[PDB]
């Protein structure tokens, strides 16, 4: 797993991403912004009841971020490097923006919580493993640290070469060896949907491991969150245009449109 | 390699024909519904203007007959369950395409070029898109009936022999995204070939129409629950933290 500062050119960061399916970006989010956001979402996180048994076994998952945290909708969402890398991954010259959000979720592995099974994120699109290691990307998660990731508080366990394996399968597996995603608040891993990984078991006793996941998918795929339905137009009018398209308030013809027109015309976001 | 079945035909006998040839269903939509629907969308279609083809998608808001009768077709869902489910399908688009006198032939294509990676998955790939292309007015060799190619789905690598899609009002052609086809030249002087397209796609795929964002909720409440999920007003995809989006919108 290579590592870059977020001051590094996008061509550089994305090259390691293509090769290994997986890069680490240091200060991908400014640590002051991450702690404002984290502070802002805290009354809501406290209001979440942990379950013990499931992917929600002693894990907090919370997606109401753009509606709850001003720092998220105004500053954290407006990451230029993210869009450079997303552009390079998903977009074709002349087709607009080739990507949108699948989900934007804070995941907090509680203490004692168990190692999540080794999966690929692209198992969500069941057919995608068949196109093989040389398939186009469907999914890229920018899995960010809100609080520190240690090996023992549940840092994501990643397999670096998974990106290029012979047969991408449901991990029916013939090899049935993982590395922790150690990082500091503000860092992030940028992970292909081809990369095998899973949450780590939080062996600590009070270290609530908090993360901020930006799950992005190609324009032609349906997201797990019905964002433009449950986000209010009040918040949407505070987002930048590229961010409104991230959440399905714009079409920025091809998909998610109104008779070939952008849906944002209908919603008032675009005026002729 | 192209078969025709009634609408009383057993859905598997219909799905078995779809599967190997990539199926015609006579009387898919009852002719009297299709007739009334076409009457309701007619003012709005009057209100529309080198390509000499009219396309109209605001069917759920325009037409009570479509909204309440034509959308509720139990055979359309029996077949989509057999094609997509492991509700594992939703709508891609609902369009009235009306080809006008003199309009040229449209280029042959597979509908699944919309998801540009699907052809690479070959002729044994899972289905991404099913179109139920139902005839509103009659289709004839003259007025530009669709040209289709029946075995072109099963081809190893995804000027050409074809069949015209001859049908009466109410008949559908149920067509895989893998099937090559194209509207014909409308050579008539007066025959506006009107058609009704149900483009359906599997649940993991995005639609070209942002239905739940332009169909008003005054309409959305007068859809059956399966038809609300068809249009994106219910839901695991398209949710609200795993919870059904239907709740937050008040329909559940
Ligand atoms: O939190 C982690 O370490 C991984 C989480 C993950 O992979 C998921 O939420 O699907
Ligand atoms: Mn995952
Ligand atoms: Mn077509």
- Print burial letters for B74-84: b (CB count within 10 Å at least 16), e (below 16): ebbbebbeebb
The answer to whether the Cα torsion of A85, A88, A94, A97 is positive or negative is negative
3-state DSSP assignment of residue A196? coil
Instruction: Report how far ligand 2's centroid is from the alpha carbon of A88 (Å).
Output: 22
CA distances from A83 to A61, A99, A239, B6, B28 (A): 24, 9, 15, 52, 47
Instruction: Report how far ligand 3's centroid is from the alpha carbon of B233 (Å).
Output: 26
Residue A247: name the closest of A226, A266, A271 by CA. Answer: A226
Give the bridge partners for A108, in sequence order.
A60, A210
H helices of A109-176, in order, are none
Residue B120: name the closest of B152, B177, B151, B158 by CA. Answer: B158
Residue B19: name the closest of B93, B83, B86, B106 by CA. Answer: B83
Q: Which residue's alpha carbon is nearest to atom 5 within ligand 1? A: A199
- Print burial letters for A25-52: b (CB count within 10 Å at least 16), e (below 16): bebbbeeebbbbbbeebeebeeeeeeee
Beta-carbon contacts of residue B141 (< 8 Å; ≥ 6 apart): B164, B166, B184
- Closest ligand to C-alpha of residue A120 is 2
Residue found by looking up tokens 């099963």 in the block:
B154
Beta-carbon contacts of residue A46 (< 8 Å; ≥ 6 apart): none
Query: Which among A130, A222, A267 has the least Cβ separation from residue B206?
Result: A222
Residue B72: name the closest of B8, B121, B29, B16 by CA. Answer: B29
**Chain A contact residues (CB < 8 Å to B):** 61-64, 124-127, 130-131, 135-136, 219-226, 228-230, 248, 251, 254-259, 263, 266-267
Residue B135: name the closest of B176, B172, B99 by CA. Answer: B172
Contact A215, A121 (CB under 8 A): yes
Contact A98, A91 (CB under 8 A): yes
The greatest distance separating any two alpha carbons of chain B, rounded to the nearest whole angstrom, comes to: 55
∠ CA B216-B220-B222, nearest 5°, is: 130
CA distances from B40 to B59, B153, B196 (A): 9, 36, 14
CATH code of B78's domain: 2.60.120.620
The answer to whether the Cα torsion of B62, B68, B69, B73 is positive or negative is positive
Compare all CA atoms of chain A with the CA of B244 and give the residue at the minimum distance. Answer: A226
Long-range CB contacts for residues B43-48, cutoff 8 Å, separation at least 24: B45/B96, B45/B98
Measured between alpha carbons, how far is B140 from B191 in angstroms, rounded to an integer?
10
3-state DSSP assignment of residue A237? coil
Q: Is residue A272 part of a domain?
A: no
Residue A219: name the closest of A192, A246, A191, A259 by CA. Answer: A246
Q: Is residue A113 part of a domain?
A: yes
**According to the entry, how was the structure determined?**
X-ray
**How many CA atoms are closer than 13 Å to the CA of A180, on its beta-carbon side?**
16
Residue span of the structural domain in which B110 resides = 4-249
Measured between alpha carbons, how far is B232 from B213 in angstroms, rounded to an integer?
9
Beta-carbon contacts of residue A218 (< 8 Å; ≥ 6 apart): A90, A98, A99, A136, A137, A138, A139
Rounded to the nearest angstrom, the minimum Cα separation between A267 and chain B is 8
3-state DSSP assignment of residue B178? coil
The answer to whether the Cα torsion of A155, A159, A163, A168 is positive or negative is negative
CA distances from B103 to A77, B143, B166, B232 (A): 47, 9, 18, 34
Running DSSP on this structure, what letter comes out for residue B222? T
Instruction: Report how far ligand 3's centroid is from the alpha carbon of B110 (Å).
Output: 6
Measured between alpha carbons, how far is B160 from B178 in angstroms, rounded to an integer?
16
Residue B232: name the closest of A25, A16, A81, A227 by CA. Answer: A227
- H or E stretch at A65: helix A65-68
* Tally of structural domains, chain A: 1
Measured between alpha carbons, how far is A9 from B237 in angstroms, rounded to an integer?
35
Listed by the residue before each break, gaps in chain A with C–N over 2.5 Å are 53, 171, 176, 252
Measured between alpha carbons, how far is B58 from A259 in angstroms, rounded to an integer?
9
CA distances from A207 to A33, A179, A225, B237 (A): 21, 20, 28, 31
First to last CA, chain A: 47
Measured between alpha carbons, how far is B58 from B53 in angstroms, rounded to an integer?
16
H helices of chain B, in order, are 11-21, 31-40, 42-46, 59-62, 64-65, 74-84, 211-214, 217-220, 225-230, 245-248
- H or E stretch at A44: helix A42-46
Beta-carbon contacts of residue A172 (< 8 Å; ≥ 6 apart): none
3-state DSSP assignment of residue B13? helix
Measured between alpha carbons, how far is B243 from A89 in angstroms, rounded to an integer?
30
Measured between alpha carbons, how far is A257 from A248 in angstroms, rounded to an integer?
10
Measured between alpha carbons, how far is B120 from A60 in angstroms, rounded to an integer?
39
Q: Is residue A228 part of a domain?
A: yes
Query: In what order do the strands lie in the sheet containing B163-164?
Result: B109-110, B180-182, B147-148, B163-164
* DSSP structure string for B27-39: TSS-HHHHHHHHH
Please list all protein residues whose beta carbon sits less than 5 angstroms from ligand 2, which is an ion. A 121
The greatest distance separating any two alpha carbons of chain A, rounded to the nearest whole angstrom, comes to: 57
Measured between alpha carbons, how far is B57 from B95 in angstroms, rounded to an integer?
4
Binding site of A for substrate, by residue number, is 61, 116, 156, 209
Residue A223: name the closest of B206, B212, B235, B233 by CA. Answer: B206
């Amino acid at each position: 797993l290579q590592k870059f500062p977020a001051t590094a050119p996008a061509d550089e960061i994305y090259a390691a991403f293509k090769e290994d399916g997986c890069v680490i970006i240091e200060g991908f989010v400014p640590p002051d912004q991450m702690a404002r956001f984290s502070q802002e979402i805290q009354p809501a996180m406290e209001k979440i009841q942990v379950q013990v048994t499931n992917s929600n076994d002693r894990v907090k998952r919370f997606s109401k971020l753009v509606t709850t945290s001003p720092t998220f909708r105004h500053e954290i969402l407006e990451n230029d490097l993210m869009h450079e890398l997303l552009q390079r991954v998903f977009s074709k010259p002349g087709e607009g923006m080739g990507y949108h959000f699948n989900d934007t979720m804070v995941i907090e592995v509680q203490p004692g919580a168990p190692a999540q099974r080794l999966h690929r994120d692209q198992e969500l699109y069941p057919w995608w493993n068949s196109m093989g290691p040389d398939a186009p990307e469907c999914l890229v998660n920018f899995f960010c640290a809100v609080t520190p990731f240690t090996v023992e508080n549940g840092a994501t366990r990643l397999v670096p070469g998974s990106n290029r394996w012979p047969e991408l399968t449901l991990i029916d597996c013939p090899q049935y060896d993982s590395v922790p995603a150690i990082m500091q608040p503000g860092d992030c891993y940028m992970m292909s949907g081809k990369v095998i990984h899973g949450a780590g078991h939080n062996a600590t006793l009070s270290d609530q491991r908090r993360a901020l996941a930006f799950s992005t998918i190609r324009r032609e795929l349906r997201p797990v969150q019905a964002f433009p339905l449950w986000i209010p137009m009040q918040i949407a009018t505070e987002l930048s245009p590229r961010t409104q398209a991230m959440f399905g308030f714009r079409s920025s013809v091809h998909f998610w449109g109104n008779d070939g027109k952008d849906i944002g015309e209908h919603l008032g976001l675009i005026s002729s």
